[PDB]
Each structure stands twice: as structure tokens, then as C-alpha cells.
Amino acid sequence: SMQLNPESADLRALAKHLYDSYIKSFPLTKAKARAILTGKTTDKSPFVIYDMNSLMMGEDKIKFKHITPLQEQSKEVAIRIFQGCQFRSVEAVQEITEYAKSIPGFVNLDLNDQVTLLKYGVHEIIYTMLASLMNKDGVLISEGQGFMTREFLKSLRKPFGDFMEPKFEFAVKFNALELDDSDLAIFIAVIILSGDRPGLLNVKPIEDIQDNLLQALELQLKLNHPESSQLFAKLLQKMTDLRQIVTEHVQLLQVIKKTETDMSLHPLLQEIYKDLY
Ligand SMILES: O=C(O)CSc1nc(Cl)cc(Nc2cccc3c2CCCC3)n1
Ligand SMILES: O=C(O)CSc1nc(Cl)cc(Nc2cccc3c2CCCC3)n1
Numbered sequence: 001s002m003q004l005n006p007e008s009a010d011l012r013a014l015a016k017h018l019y020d021s022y023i024k025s026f027p028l029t030k031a032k033a034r035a036i037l038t039g040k041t042t043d044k045s046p047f048v049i050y051d052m053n054s055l056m057m058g059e060d061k062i063k064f065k066h067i068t069p070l071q072e073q074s075k076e077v078a079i080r081i082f083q084g085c086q087f088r089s090v091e092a093v094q095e096i097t098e099y100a101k102s103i104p105g106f107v108n109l110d111l112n113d114q115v116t117l118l119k120y121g122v123h124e125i126i127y128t129m130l131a132s133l134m135n136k137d138g139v140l141i142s143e144g145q146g147f148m149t150r151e152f153l154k155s156l157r158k159p160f161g162d163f164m165e166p167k168f169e170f171a172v173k174f175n176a177l178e179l180d181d182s183d184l185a186i187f188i189a190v191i192i193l194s195g196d197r198p199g200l201l202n203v204k205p206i207e208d209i210q211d212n213l214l215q216a217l218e219l220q221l222k223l224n225h226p227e228s229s230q231l232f233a234k235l236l237q238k239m240t241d242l243r244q245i246v247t248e249h250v251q252l253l254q255v256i257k258k259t260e261t262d263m264s265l266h267p268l269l270q271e272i273y274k275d276l277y
Helices: 006-025 030-038 052-059 077-100 111-133 150-154 165-175 181-192 203-224 231-259 267-276
Strands: 047-049 138-141 146-149
Touching: 006 077, 006 181, 006 203, 030 111, 030 138, 030 181, 047 052, 052 077, 077 111, 077 181, 077 267, 111 138, 111 165, 111 181, 111 231, 111 267, 138 150, 146 150, 150 165, 165 231, 181 203, 181 231, 203 231, 231 267
Parallel strands: 047 146
Antiparallel strands: 138 146
């Protein structure tokens, strides 16, 4: 007995609020990323980076919110690509922070708890949303203007040759669930409002918001996905997979930070990583 009642109408309102906020926070949506990847888009085709030549032709075109325009970019391709990826992570943090502030209840939480939830949550969300940009062959870069191949990334010298591999492995399975932006908006909100992050001051108000988000997600998935009766349970499983991906990421960043003692790690990512370990 699923029903239309005031409770369901409020859960649908929350779902729409989250969708509308997601569209305002994240310029490259899954809908847009799929249209690019499938060809279906009428926008110009992205530039493809599939080898060292196309990498150099392509970079003659890549751009960031904060341009870092001196000999601040390493000469070595692998380190430069990795530093570009760090800049993209920091841009994603900024977008995800803006999204989180639109989640009803979030800005009323203690500001330390807001920062804690973002600190321990953002990488789970980054890899969730990175799957939107990925297919079997590669990943959209430069906000959908470019595409870099999976095998090109695998070709970078140790220890830079597999930092995206676990995320491609997560994405091909996650993408098979065929979530849309309306589903993802709620899924991401649920992950951010996790009461079991370390050092939270007020756990109950976070759990109370999450329980409401979880009810919203379960209703959205039942309405939006008539083809599965398992999709809610499967997404709960994906949330625990994402924590493993983030642990494995931190470990790899330790190996890199101890092999490549010369290359600079972005200091805001360092603040996050130091406690994620
Ligand atoms: O963040 C670091 O510590 C660098 S390692 C890293 N690994 C991955 Cl799997 C992704 C990613 N950056 C990113 C974040 C969001 C979007 C995109 C990208 C990297 C390029 C594709 C688009 N950065
Ligand atoms: O754009 C993404 O989503 C990936 S970031 C990335 N990917 C590639 Cl394949 C190359 C590259 N290059 C680079 C890194 C850091 C700074 C700069 C440059 C190239 C352009 C000049 C500034 N940066």
C-alpha cells in the first residue's frame, strides 16, 4: 500500500526542491554529459585526448575558475594532469558546498557540523557525480569541452597510472542503474547528511534530515524506476562502496605524496585527506 497523502506530497516537494537546487549548483548535469557522450548533443563535439600528441593539442584549449598561469604547472605530463585533476576536485568541492547549503535544514545545523559533513562527504559525492561524466572509453574533462581516454590515463608513469581506474570500475556498474539527475539530487543529499561522520556535535538533527531524505529517495526511485524493485537497496550498497573508494583513494594519495615528495598537493585537499586517513 503506497498512497498519495500529505506525507507523499511533501516528499515530492522536497525532491523537486533538491532537483531545482542541483540544476543551479552543477553546470554539467548527467543529462548534458550523456548527450555529449552519445553524440546526441547539437553542441560542438569535445576535443579527444587519446595520446601525447592530442594531449598537447587539447591543453592548447583547457581552462580553470582560478587560472594558475606561471611555471606553477609541472613540466612532466603525469604530474600536470594530476594537478589539473586536483584543481577540478577543488572546483567540485565549491559546487557541492553550494548544493549542500540548499538542502533544507543544512544551513540551520551548527556551522562546524556543516564543514564536518562536507569534509568527510565531498569525495563520495565527487565520485558519484564523476560517473555521470564517464563511459567505458573515458571521461569528460574541462566541463564537457574535452574527453580523455581511460587507456591514456592508464598509460601515465607510476605512480599516476591508476588513480582514476577504481572510479571507472565504480562508474560502469553505477551507470548501469540508469539514475537521472532527479534521482542523483536526492542520493547526494542523503550521503551529505550522514550522522556517523567523525567529530559531529549534534548527530540527531542530521539523522532527522537524512531519514526525511531517505524517504524522499525511496519514493522517487519507486515512481521513477518501475523496472526495478531493488534499486533503493542497491543505492544503499553503492553508498558503502563509495566509502571504500574514498579509503583506497586516500591510500593512493599517501603513496603519491611519499614517492613524489617534490610535487605540490593542493592545501585544501590536504586538509580533507589528513583526517580521511
Ligand atoms: O582529487 C585529487 O586528489 C586528484 S586525483 C582525482 N582522481 C579522480 Cl578519480 C578525479 C579527480 N578529479 C576530478 C573531480 C571531478 C571531476 C573530474 C575530475 C578529474 C577529471 C575528470 C573530471 N581527481
Ligand atoms: O579539465 C579536467 O577536467 C581535467 S584537468 C587537466 N586535464 C588534462 Cl588532460 C590536462 C590538464 N592540464 C593542466 C593542468 C594544470 C594546469 C593547466 C593545465 C593545462 C592548461 C594550462 C593550465 N589538466
